């Protein structure tokens, strides 16, 4: 639902790159160039950022249980 | 339900010996070293160091089961030598090699950070 912390394969930290990745994408980067800007050179970490679906943004459309 | 704790690969159970030496009766001057809570990391280096000893006739290791956490190292030496002595010398040589490698890596790091 949320960006993983580490890359499943190598263990590189990708948790701090989702927001930067999105900011680069709205900056008219291609996904490949964006992944290059964040330093994801192994195709495992590129897999992590490139195949992520941010479902938490949809789960935050529901009001919480307590106000 | 059946997951062993992850520390069981590294930690010795109470009353369980780290290493056990058993005389191999098939051939003379051979021993089996059953080392608990170790894996290929030490087995491979100990075997390969023992292979550098010309007085060692056989040096092999196996992890009998990956789900279990022991290794067995079989060492056969020449009659004038001993498998226990060979194993001891192999560990001593590995320790000296790693000490030298560590000191040289420290020197290389110092050179790289300085210039």
């Amino acid at each position: 639902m949320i960006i993983p912390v580490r890359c499943f394969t190598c263990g590189k930290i990708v948790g701090n790159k989702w927001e930067a990745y999105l900011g680069l994408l709205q900056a008219e980067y291609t996904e490949g160039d964006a992944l290059d800007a964040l330093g994801l050179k192994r195709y495992c970490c590129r897999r992590m950022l490139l195949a992520h679906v941010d479902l938490i943004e949809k789960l935050l459309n529901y009001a919480p249980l307590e106000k | 339900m059946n997951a062993p704790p992850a520390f069981e690969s590294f930690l010795l159970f109470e009353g369980e010996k780290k290493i056990t030496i058993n005389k191999d009766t098939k051939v003379p001057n051979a021993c089996l070293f059953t080392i608990n809570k170790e894996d290929h990391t030490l087995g491979n280096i100990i075997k390969s160091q023992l292979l550098k000893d010309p007085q060692v006739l056989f040096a092999g290791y196996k992890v009998p089961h990956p789900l279990e956490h022991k290794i067995i190292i079989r060492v056969q030496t020449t009659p004038d030598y001993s498998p226990q002595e060979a194993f001891t010398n192999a560990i001593t040589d590995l320790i000296s090699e790693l000490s030298l490698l560590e000191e040289r890596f420290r020197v290389a790091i110092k050179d790289k950070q300085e210039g």
């Binding site: 009001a63 919480p64 249980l65 307590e66 106000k67 | 992850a6």
Partner: protein, 46 residues
């Protein structure tokens, strides 16, 4: 002893005793949720 519940619609903390119809006092909604316990549950971050 109080067993305070939360409303599914108005999210109001309200106390309800046993043998009482399950009704929120602020909006009358019929579905209530218990609050998180105070007991100490521990997680190994694994």
């Amino acid at each position: 002893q109080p067993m305070i519940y939360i409303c599914g619609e108005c999210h109001t903390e309200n106390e309800i005793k046993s043998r009482d119809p399950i009704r929120c006092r602020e909006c009358g909604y019929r579905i209530m949720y218990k609050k998180r316990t105070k007991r100490l549950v521990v997680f190994d971050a694994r």
